[PDB]
Curated annotation (Swiss-Prot):
The lineage of its organism: Eukaryota, Metazoa, Chordata, Craniata, Vertebrata. It is found in: Nucleus; Cytoplasm. The chain holds residues 1193 to 1246 of 1246 of the full protein. This is Superkiller complex protein 2. Belongs to the helicase family. SKI2 subfamily. It is linked to Trichohepatoenteric syndrome 2: A syndrome characterized by intrauterine growth retardation, severe diarrhea in infancy requiring total parenteral nutrition, facial dysmorphism, immunodeficiency, and hair abnormalities, mostly trichorrhexis nodosa. Hepatic involvement contributes to the poor prognosis of affected patients.
Length: 54
RNA sequence: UUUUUUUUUUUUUUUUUUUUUUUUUUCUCCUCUUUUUUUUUUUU
């Protein structure tokens, strides 16, 4: 479980960039379930990162 | 005997206003028959 988190943070970027395409076309049927997936993907272990964040 | 790298949730907020129910039409139009008009009066 070292490459899973990197694959996750790679997936979340394309899901964040598909919103601009769904908005450009004008088809919010997919842009709504994609927004729900985007908010459904953000966990807390992903953002742990390093020790002295703050 | 299969390594290394590919960022992410738009920025903004400390704007004034001194009125008052309604609201706006419909034309001129042959009234039939015993009468002058009876009448005080008293019992409420």
């Amino acid at each position: 479980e070292g490459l899973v988190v990197r694959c996750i943070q790679r997936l979340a970027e394309m899901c964040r960039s598909l919103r601009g395409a769904a908005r450009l076309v004008g088809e919010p049927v997919l842009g709504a379930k994609m927004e729900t997936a985007a908010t459904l993907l953000r966990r807390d272990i992903v953002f742990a990162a390093s020790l002295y964040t703050q």
